[PDB]
Design a protein around this ligand. Structure first.
Ligand SMILES: [Cl-]
Ligand SMILES: [Cl-]
Ligand SMILES: [Cl-]
Ligand SMILES: [Cl-]
Ligand SMILES: [Zn+2]
Ligand SMILES: [Zn+2]
Lengths: 340, 335
């Protein structure tokens, strides 16, 4: 059932080995329509959680609403990259560089720092082709290029754009408060991996914000139109949101143009299904990506019970097999029956 | 019974993520010194019990016949990084028995340490079975077989004599019941048996003290525990928690990680064995937990206590080097 106020997270994902549960994850999920009505919840959807990268599409609204995306000729690939936690594959790097170039800037304008890919196969490619990663390899480089472009198009100096009272960060707080109805302030702020603010808010508000983006409900016309554009871009070019081997990219290849998903660090996922009018947010309590992936897939699957092929493809992510170094099947990562 | 929150991960002013888990600290006589959570539910030890699985290599006489020292014994007890020294040592152990890389049945994998992984990617097209974190343990298994003229082919199999012997050793050390219904296949394709954390901790306390063990098993157990503490690079490697934790108080603390958030440990001078599990399987939580549990026993040795608390409460810095939060064992470890 639905409890807006419980503080207790149920077991949402089991990891088996042999015939026994070896590890278990707890978590919380909110599913909300464009009007804010709760369709499904699990666990604590009231305590503030940090969305991390899961809200990058909300943070991309300045890039679109300012007219910068249109002025620089950005299409679906650039918008998807601005919404991305990308693998740092060379396609992502070259596209981020071209976004900066069109605004008259380069990698030196980035304030996010560098890191090696969090995808092991891409990390191996990076190690073999690079002495060290650059800021363009950072998973947030498309988001940050979007920030720099939003500033340059408006003649706002991008220097310091990560700072709490830089005009860009002022604007992003206002956007996020309006979309989500949450109160965003220093007491709920932390610093993200890319050195910008990240604001903790209840999962219910996060899901409602995505439901609004997906449906337009409660949004002024320009924000509704820009939200559609960002959601459609991510669904149209899902490699640019994540990349090779990544669950967000593959989830958005199951039912092309119909499902929006986005991961955040520490086990957050956000999602939306525009044709159903719904937004989803969730978090695995311990922060594991594998648990958040199984949870988002099991939650999405409930909306596709009438379409076997889509349902089966989503359930393949809700129940993932594990193989050891010899290829032997050893167990599975499975969403529990709370999702059924 | 719901396990308590053992580790909090903060960001800004707030707890961002939380881990639950269980810990058992048992003496050589089986008395429980300290526990958190449910220490009775069966848990897979994974690599945390490698030192128990190394007993055939020592007790059979194989280690002495092949001229093994503390480095080889530590490697037999290791989840190593697959650095060049680990690879060369596992190859050398196989060669003493008249075997080679082809005798290994564990498969190959890239290092689970990122810096070593980068070095491997730049120097190799692909890892070999020698790079597997379990290659020293498996070389030890093959040497135990060959020394006794047991055919090592199929040594991973449930009724191979080596696996029969390992079950008998581990049932004696831990008091647990091991059988097919509590068995799974581990990462290196051998059996791993789920057992209560209490029994696992008691087994390590028996290894560390000799209590309840026959003389040859007590002596071999002491040899293995001491080798690991004497050569802690060979148990794990550069950058690794198990190696650093065994460099804090040289010769005094034994630790061993297992996949899915297990740790085992022992403090021989206190007659203590330790086991624990992060319920969600996170390595970061198990590392903070083992450090905080060890710290309980060193509170009046300030330099040792401080170095253990540095693993119990770890800062997190972002890509620009800014402190963003912490990974901290909770107050239940100091209560
Ligand atoms: Cl609006
Ligand atoms: Cl994970
Ligand atoms: Cl007792
Ligand atoms: Cl015995
Ligand atoms: Zn970021
Ligand atoms: Zn192994």
């Amino acid at each position: 059932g639905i409890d807006p106020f419980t503080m207790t997270n149920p077991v949402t994902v089991e990891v088996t080995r042999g015939l026994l549960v070896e590890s278990r994850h707890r978590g919380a999920v909110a599913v909300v329509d464009g009007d804010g009505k709760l369709f499904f919840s699990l666990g604590d959807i009231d305590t503030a959680v940090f969305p991390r990268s899961a809200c990058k599409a909300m943070q991309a609204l300045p890039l679109v609403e300012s007219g910068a995306a249109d002025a620089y000729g950005f299409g679906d690939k650039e918008l998807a990259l601005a919404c991305a936690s990308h693998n740092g594959e060379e396609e992502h790097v070259a596209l981020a560089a071209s976004m900066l170039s069109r605004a008259g800037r380069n990698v030196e304008a980035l304030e996010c720092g560098a890191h090696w890919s969090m995808n092991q196969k891409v990390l191996i490619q990076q190690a073999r082709s690079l002495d060290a990663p650059t800021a363009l390899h950072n998973n947030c480089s498309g988001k940050h290029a979007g920030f720099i472009c939003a500033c340059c198009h408006r003649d706002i100096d991008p220097k310091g754009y990560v700072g709490y009272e830089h005009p860009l960060q002022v604007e992003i707080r206002a956007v996020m408060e309006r979309l989500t109805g949450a109160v965003l302030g220093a007491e709920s702020c932390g610093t993200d991996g890319c050195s910008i603010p990240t604001y903790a808010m209840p999962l219910r508000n996060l899901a409602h914000g995505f439901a609004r983006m997906a449906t337009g409900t409660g949004l002024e016309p320009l924000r509704a139109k820009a939200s559609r554009r960002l959601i459609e871009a991510c669904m149209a070019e899902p490699f640019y949101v994540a990349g090779s081997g990544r669950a967000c990219t593959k989830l958005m290849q199951i039912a092309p143009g119909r499902i929006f998903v986005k991961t955040g660090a520490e086990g957050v996922f956000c999602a939306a299904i525009p044709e159903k009018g719904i937004g989803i947010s969730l978090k695995s309590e311990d922060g594991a990506t594998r648990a958040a992936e199984a949870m988002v897939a099991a939650t999405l699957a409930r909306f596709f019970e009438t379409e076997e092929t889509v349902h089966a493809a989503l359930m393949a992510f809700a129940a993932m097999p594990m193989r050891n170094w010899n290829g032997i099947h050893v167990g599975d990562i499975r969403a529990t029956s709370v999702f059924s």
